[PDB]
Amino acid sequence: GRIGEVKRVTKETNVSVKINLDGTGVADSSSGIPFLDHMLDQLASHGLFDVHVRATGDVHIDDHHTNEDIALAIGTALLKALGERKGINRFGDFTAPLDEALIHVSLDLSGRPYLGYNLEIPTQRVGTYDTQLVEHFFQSLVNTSGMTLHIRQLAGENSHHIIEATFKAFARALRQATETDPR
Amino acid sequence: GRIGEVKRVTKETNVSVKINLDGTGVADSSSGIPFLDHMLDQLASHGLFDVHVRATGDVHIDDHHTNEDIALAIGTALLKALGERKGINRFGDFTAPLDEALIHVSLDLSGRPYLGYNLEIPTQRVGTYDTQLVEHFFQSLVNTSGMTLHIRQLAGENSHHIIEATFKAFARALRQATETDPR
Amino acid sequence: GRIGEVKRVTKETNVSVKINLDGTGVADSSSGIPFLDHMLDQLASHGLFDVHVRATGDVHIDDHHTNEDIALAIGTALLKALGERKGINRFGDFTAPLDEALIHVSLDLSGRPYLGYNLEIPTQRVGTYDTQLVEHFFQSLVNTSGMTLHIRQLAGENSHHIIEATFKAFARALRQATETDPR
Amino acid sequence: GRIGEVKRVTKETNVSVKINLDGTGVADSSSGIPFLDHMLDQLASHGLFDVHVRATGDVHIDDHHTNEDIALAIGTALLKALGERKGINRFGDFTAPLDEALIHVSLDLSGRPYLGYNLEIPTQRVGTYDTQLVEHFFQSLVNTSGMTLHIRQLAGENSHHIIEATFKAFARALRQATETDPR
Amino acid sequence: GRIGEVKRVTKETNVSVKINLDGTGVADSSSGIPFLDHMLDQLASHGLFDVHVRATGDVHIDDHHTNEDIALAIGTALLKALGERKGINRFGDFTAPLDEALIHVSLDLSGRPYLGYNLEIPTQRVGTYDTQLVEHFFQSLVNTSGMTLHIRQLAGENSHHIIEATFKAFARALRQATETDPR
């Protein structure tokens, strides 16, 4: 059905991205960022999107540049994939937990970008992943997607659980919005 | 489908209300209060109700009497159309964003009226519509409706957005509650 | 020279914007919001932009929708105008007083939208204009324009003064950024 | 160039002044207040004005009378020199440091007098110059001048450095404002 | 044009630095510190300096010794290149954004060294680069450069952004001060 394909090439990065909204949950990501792939594999698995990401970047500097241009790419792919937005639910709201974590995501494929981020992560790094990037990821994805997106933390100690549960609750909500409403 | 109709006159106002719970979203409000029409036009447009309102009132004094009497009629009209309540969900739950605002609405078509209203609207006026009247509209609605309704502000700065996001949220939660569940 | 043009027709509004970055100071704005027109003439007179707005919207409900759609147009007109963005300054920075008022605007034409708004206006209305719409004007303008924009209140009592000083500093920095850098 | 000339004679003082907006840097000031001459020399040197001041007053009493009248004359001759204020930038904004001091100066040759003075000088006397008189010089300069002026201390420990940096940033921004703009 | 060159060899590092004040933005750094190279390309890119750096040091202990010997060299390369300092602006002042961040950077090539540094970086590492070394870099660069330099943070969450914004504003203000004034 609905597939979005973007190939962006900056000085800093090389990003190839393919999203099927009406997928079966196929996860095939290789960004050079081990933890970000794991989050994108959740995105596929939990909202049954098919996600094909393939990137190569400044990883020697920071993770910052690659994190960002993948995120911007995914949002542009999301926009092309929704087409003219004919009869989709459009809104989606799901609270998913992971053990002690409990994350709430409400969103709306509005056309006007906004990221409400209320998410305190107590450690500065999960694996090698700078933990400030999760915010940056979602910001960049929202800015090209045109997606109004609030994310709210109700509970959580463990930083791995917190980001995983967020991506779990973002996927299930995103599907809810991409699916077709019997209008 | 399921339709409730109410004529209702007093010394102060004259009010007439036709509501289709199984409509297509035909918004048809002319109350003498431009702002309230707009919110009633979102009730229809998001809940897929057909909403017909016609009214004249003491607007030259206050919007108070007309906002209250319309609200009272709509709840009475909602009550008739629901009729026997045969096999409906009864409960609706929906959080809705409109940019920075984020409003949760939980309801239960119970028979016992309750408004839990937790909404701080920073400005006294949106257009020419007294901002205190958003609480009096849902309070009057609930009173004739036999509805149990909680409205909770989670986020919000701008007044238009907040009120509108409540009406968006409430409409999709009313729809959910009036629909038939494979019981 | 560099001219962006935008027509835009939504259910609510009918907007027609035309902006010349290399103008002479031509203000020709009639939107049906008298206050916004006066501000859009500060934009022209101080940025030496030629500005031509023409709009009709739901003024009877609110100024909100008309405010919003003009802003989204002005921001789009800007992005057509800039085109390739070759050999321009890219960064603006100007602090501007108007009597007791003092407003710092810093901007970067980056292709990534951000609003930093630290402006407490002590009255709900100047003329008939809802004061919350000043923020929504720059927010919506930024959202299509692709502009990183910080606005900073350093001083101000009079609400007319604060908004006017804002459009003065914005305009002069918009100029600094849009002009050619001897590269 | 543009030359202001003002000879004014109270009971208390005999002031003579000649400023040249389009000067070259010609420091020529004797006032009977050695520190103020050191500040007037910085005004000519950093703004590239040709400043000429010659004064006598009740110095045996206080530096007050003489400080005020010189300030009142410099303002007036600034005005006479501007004339019709045709084609000039008009606005000036500059932040100059001196060692640990850092003072920001925004002004506007506006026709309307105003002084915001946010400047804590920790000592009561630099040499023999009463430290309260710095405020009084820019206050009196501003009334006759019709200038809008904000002086903001962002850093500073040493009293000499604070005042001199204030005279440096005043100078450089005043230049900006008197300079022609290609309209 | 104005070129400074420096080879500085210690028991710890071998540092080679050529700087071109009147360049076209030539970036060319390999210091063994990936993030410092990125900040150097930003300096070369935004001041239109040409920046050639080559370094080998204790990167296996710390990044500290390399960080400091490189920046001490760069200050010295700046000082040779500047010469007698004839008819340059001397004062450079610029506030620059990078998304949520906003750093103001006022300086004066005075001959007397000073660093007012008011920057709170919320993480301890960008990439593998100690976040404390940013201050020490600007501190060393100031000591031999004979420069007066204030760096004020007005906003910022993301560390990468904060520092890159510091380097963007440092660059555009150094440009301003080394450029020639029509005197």
Place this chain on the structure above:
Amino acid sequence: GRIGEVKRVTKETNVSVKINLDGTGVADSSSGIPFLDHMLDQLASHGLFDVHVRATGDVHIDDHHTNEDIALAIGTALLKALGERKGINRFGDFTAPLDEALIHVSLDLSGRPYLGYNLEIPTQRVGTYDTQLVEHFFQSLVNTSGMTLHIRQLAGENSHHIIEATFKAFARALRQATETDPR
């Protein structure tokens, strides 16, 4: 007797004002601002001045420009009426109540502009009149008038009473100051 006339035309207003310092209390104000007319009527009546105002302004936008330009015209009209200021009290000082309110005006015809304004008016509008304009009227009057005016709210709840009592007190002390002293 002592008569001051002024015609002043801007791009926003057309103001004509005449004031007789030795009048008999004749009130002749049509300003486009019904509340300020009422305040000038008190100004004549309570100081026995003959006040003639006829104005035309942006009133569709704001009352701002019209309020300011009338204020500035009265001050120039006052300065002229006074001429060479020979044999007159110079200093006035009156405290006038209006019911619960109590204002203390204490002026000085100093040729030196200052306003002390220590008034807290608890509502945003008296009629259609923006309450902020009271300060701005008096600020603008003082700037072109060369008067030293202190306004002290000692008591007051109702805003109509506070502004009217200010104009009462202000008039009785302007009258006192302009009267002659057996010299």
